[PDB]
Design a protein around this ligand. Structure first.
Ligand SMILES: NC(=O)c1ccc[n+]([C@@H]2O[C@H](COP(=O)([O-])OP(=O)(O)OC[C@H]3O[C@@H](n4cnc5c(N)ncnc54)[C@H](OP(=O)(O)O)[C@@H]3O)[C@@H](O)[C@H]2O)c1
Ligand SMILES: Nc1nc(=O)c2nc(CNc3ccc(C(=O)N[C@@H](CCC(=O)O)C(=O)O)cc3)cnc2[nH]1
Length: 160
């Protein structure tokens, strides 16, 4: 199989602020849905709380060292257990946040990254990955518009 990370990064790899997303980009949330639908998604407990409900049409797997508090999703206590709980699927999507991205990046073969042209204060960052390890296989830039207040670029990287 294959482990992929998907994330949206503002300037300086900022991904979060006070457990929220510090921007509003519906085209990027649409890209997120398109690339995770019908796949298992692994997330940390903070990100589970920031989303606030199960993502429909996906197997939601939550990492936490503590007992689960919601039977609509699957709770696991370690990275290996989270991968196992995904079953035999072609692609596992890891959807953050910072702590969880850092643990799965060495296992990932593919990164789905949106680069957002936005300056935001953040307390959470995407991990600092070695660019030599990754080949860009897809890149699509979009200007800001009436629905998306920042320009953004969709990128898919495959591990070399
Ligand atoms: N822009 C994006 O693409 C994106 C993606 C996701 C999230 N975010 C932002 O990221 C921020 C949250 O990221 P975060 O780094 O603060 O927290 P996180 O990684 O979402 O969750 C961290 C928690 O997950 C659990 N956990 C992680 N690894 C574990 C392991 N190996 N074994 C057991 N439990 C484990 C622990 O929960 P316990 O404390 O219960 O043990 C830990 O406290 C929020 O601001 C969110 O908005 C942005
Ligand atoms: N590219 C990317 N952008 C993000 O905003 C993102 N966010 C997370 C974590 N946070 C969230 C927050 C909300 C939703 C969400 O509501 N998605 C719904 C609505 C899709 C839409 O609005 O178009 C979904 O069904 O996927 C997903 C992830 C993880 N990876 C990401 N990856």
């Amino acid at each position: 199989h294959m482990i992929s990370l998907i994330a949206a990064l503002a300037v300086d790899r900022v991904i979060g602020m006070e457990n929220a997303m510090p921007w509003n980009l519906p085209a990027d949330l649409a890209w997120f849905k398109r690339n995770t639908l019908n796949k298992p998604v692994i997330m940390g407990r903070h990100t589970w709380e920031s989303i606030g409900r199960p993502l429909p049409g996906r197997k939601n797997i939550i990492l936490s060292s503590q007992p689960g508090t919601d039977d609509r999703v699957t709770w696991v206590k370690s990275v290996d257990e989270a991968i196992a709980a995904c079953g035999d699927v072609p692609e596992i999507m890891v959807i953050g946040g910072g702590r969880v991205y850092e643990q799965f990046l060495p296992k990932a073969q593919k990164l789905y990254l949106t680069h957002i042209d936005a300056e935001v204060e953040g307390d959470t960052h995407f991990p600092d990955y070695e660019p030599d390890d990754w080949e860009s296989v897809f890149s699509e830039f979009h200007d800001a518009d009436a629905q998306n207040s920042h320009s953004y670029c969709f990128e898919i990287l495959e591990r070399r």
